[PDB]
Amino acid sequence: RNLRDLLAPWVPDAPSRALREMTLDSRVAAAGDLFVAVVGHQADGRRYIPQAIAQGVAAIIAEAKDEATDGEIREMHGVPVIYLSQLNERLSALAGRFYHEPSDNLRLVGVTGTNGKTTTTQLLAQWSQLLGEISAVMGTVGNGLLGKVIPGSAVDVQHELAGLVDQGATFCAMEVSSHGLVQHRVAALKFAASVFTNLSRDHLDYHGDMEHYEAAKWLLYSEHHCGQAIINADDEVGRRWLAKLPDAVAVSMEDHINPNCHGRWLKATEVNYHDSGATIRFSSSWGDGEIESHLMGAFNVSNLLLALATLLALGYPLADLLKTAARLQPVCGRMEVFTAPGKPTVVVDYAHTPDALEKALQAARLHCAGKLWCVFGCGGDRDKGKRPLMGAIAEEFADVAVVTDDNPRTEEPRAIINDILAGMLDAGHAKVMEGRAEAVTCAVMQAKENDVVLVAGKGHEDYQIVGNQRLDYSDRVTVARLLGVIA
Secondary structure (H helix, E strand, O other), X not given: OEHHHHHOOOOOOOOOOXXXXXXXXXXXXXXXXXXXXXXXXXXXXXXXXXXXXXXXXXXXXXXXXXXXXXXXXXXXXXXXXXXXXXXXXXXXXXXXXXXXXXXXXXXXXXXXXXXXXXXXXXXXXXXXXXXXOOEEEEOOXXXXXXXXXXXXXXXXXXXXXXXXXXXXXXXXXXXXXXXXXHOOOOOOOEOOEEEEXXXXXXXXXXXXXXXXXHHHHHHHHHHOEOOEEEEEOOOXXXXXXXXXXXXXXXXXXXXXXXXXXXXXXXXXXXXXXXXXXXXXXXXXXXXXXXXXXXXXXXXHHHHHHHHHHHXXXXXXXXXXXXHHHHHOOOOOOOOEEEOOOOOOXXXXXXXXXXXXXHHHHHHHHHOOOOOEXXXXXXXXXXXXXHHHHHHHHHHHHOOEEEEOOXXXXXXXXXXXXXXXXXXXXXXXXXXXXXXXXXXXXHHHHHOOOOOEEEEEOOXXXXXXXXXXXXXXXXHHHHHHHHHOOOO
């Protein structure tokens, strides 16, 4: 890494200097580093240029705004200080070149939208790896090769992607936040494909506001290397954008494919939601098929079809995708289904808010021929407001509400249960059982063969906090042992 080569596209004159790492933070800026001095959130990194020099940085790239002309080369204490206009906009391109263009050295798929980003990224990473890629994820769970995800600026993004390229990744599924896109955090990334899941924005009912929002987003999209566009046509904004993008792939499970356009498309024609997942029959411009999904609910059909359409658009053969679909797993503790011969279906989900609990029960209901059971509780020593709202949701969307403990901490466990029941029309209809393990056992052992039991609030968490004690406890392990299977 050399300052002169780094800046060659923008500053022909730049001096020769070996560079170690690239950093925005003057505190960790060490001997041989490139310090990048940006102006942002009422913060000016140029203030810290003297401190970075005193720590032996090899060179500095600084915002030109009010201090210098674009491309101006200065020298302080024998350290080159190069000023660039609009450095926030160019940081992605600068760090891309510094880290040897990692998005040009693997197949990068970006996923944007309010919901299903995490699941769609995991499905893309899992499916590509089943077809022979070494796959990685970048997102909210964390970054890393698949099965080794470890829990953020335009530099960090480029640095992390170069880390994955160095570990042998050939494929990366990246969650892209609306906030990341607007702050130019992925401005220079070469996306092989861009997936749009859906928009639950709200606050856009004035056609003036909907116009500006869209205008801002169209402008951003026009400036990125998006590659193949894959768009959920079951979203209203999705359809308006597909109307303007004749090369984009339209994906639907609700009959919104317009076949007159003669573009690329994929649509579920029928879904059977059963006790262990979904049978998805679909048509596409690539050919037709039937997938056996081990994921639960309508939203996970959508997420799976977006991942399928994306991998087809990148040229993965339909026959190989169909052969590997049954090996796609849920995100651990996200609508994770546990089935055993002649036992009720049990779903472990992390839902611990009223909206997540309603969504998990509506999803579970689609797979439920008999009665839907809901085992849940609320955390102690936290906001009490959700307690009656989660009671009312369990009473409405489940047939049997089993109220139990969930990390009661120092709070009287029964007091929490009382707050939950208070939100119900008929508390007497709720079943209460303390011991979480005992309440889970009660549901699982009493539920009929064609019932579904949703065990909500913990998902993947392997602890129950009682007092100051983090006790060893897993919903997944408890359910697995009762059903006679392995967690």
